[PDB]
Ligand binder design. Structure first.
Ligand code: F16
Ligand code: MG
Length: 297
């Protein structure tokens, strides 16, 4: 059981060892397409690639490659697409992927600039009157509105397939206070944000998989998805004790390498799930408490 395990690990001060064991046991599958010469400029980081078996293929005969993986959680019955922060030449591909996969939401866990360098291209419009056109994939993107909170912003975007003139509403959830290789300010802030995403319908089965990204699409993104899946699993049978967090993380790592980048992100993942469990088990008022403690206003 996670809370007792949490205490055992904290007491023995062995998060580093627990975390390293997960890395040792993590799946290793080929990433041949990602490593092809023609795709070198479609990858942000040399050591972070999508496995071939779970990579998202763009529906174009040209080059179907994008650094994105489909994490399909069978038991939990939820899917997520984890991808890297778009590069200046892959913003059209990113939106092509959102369209073809029928995604309703995009969860961004990083800032365009972190630690003095560019971690992601400005792939969405910052002003209503300045829409963006991705000519390579023939897609149009317009900012419809935005709701800025203290540590996250929610934007409503309109994505249009210029070929058919079909349009869709895309919700953008931008967590702005999560440091690279770091952890959220508190389980509260993180949980308040995850539940904001959930309440929007973006994670629902009627839509395609939500697109989740940070800079590499494995650390913060992994932490976000692990927490969500674990909470959904204990929701399925109202049995928090049946959920094995390490087991769930290992299952997710069969779909994309390096999910959860530090021992403290793993430790934070446990904290988020244990605190989130109060809501799952019937204490509805805890959601208001998180909102309060997160200081979003
Ligand atoms: O906490 C993190 C660390 C990342 C990271 C960034 C660059 C290389 C890498 O291996 C991990 S992320 O953008 O996937 N989230
Ligand atoms: Mg204005």
């Amino acid at each position: 059981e996670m809370e007792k395990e949490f205490e055992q690990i904290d007491k023995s001060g062995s998060w580093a060892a627990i975390y390293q064991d997960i890395r040792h046991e993590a799946s290793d599958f080929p990433c041949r397409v990602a490593k092809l010469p023609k795709n070198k400029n479609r990858n942000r980081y040399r050591d972070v690639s999508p496995f071939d078996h779970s990579r998202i293929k763009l529906h174009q005969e040209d080059n179907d490659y994008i650094n994105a993986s489909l994490i399909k959680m069978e038991e939990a019955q939820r899917s997520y697409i984890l991808t890297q922060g778009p590069l200046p030449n892959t913003c059209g591909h990113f939106w092509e992927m959102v369209w073809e996969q029928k995604s309703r939401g995009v969860v961004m866990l990083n800032r365009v600039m972190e630690k003095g360098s560019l971690k992601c291209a400005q792939y969405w419009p910052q002003k209503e009157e300045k829409e963006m056109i991705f000519e390579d994939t023939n897609l149009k993107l317009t900012l419809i509105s935005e709701d800025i909170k203290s540590y996250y912003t929610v934007r409503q975007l309109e994505l249009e397939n210029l070929t058919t003139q079909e349009t869709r509403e895309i919700l953008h959830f931008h967590y702005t206070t999560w440091p690279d290789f770091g952890v959220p300010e508190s389980p509260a802030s993180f949980l308040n944000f995850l539940f904001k995403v959930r309440e929007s319908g973006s994670l629902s089965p009627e839509h395609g998989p939500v697109v989740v990204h940070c800079s590499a699409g494995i650390g913060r993104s992994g932490t976000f998805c692990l927490a969500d899946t674990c909470l959904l699993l204990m929701d399925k049978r109202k049995d928090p004790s049946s959920v094995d967090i390490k087991k769930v993380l290992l299952e997710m790592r069969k779909f994309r390498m390096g999910l959860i980048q530090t021992a403290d992100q793993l430790r934070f993942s446990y904290l988020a799930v244990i605190e989130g469990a109060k809501f799952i088990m019937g204490d509805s008022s805890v959601q208001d408490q998180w909102k309060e403690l997160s200081h979003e206003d």
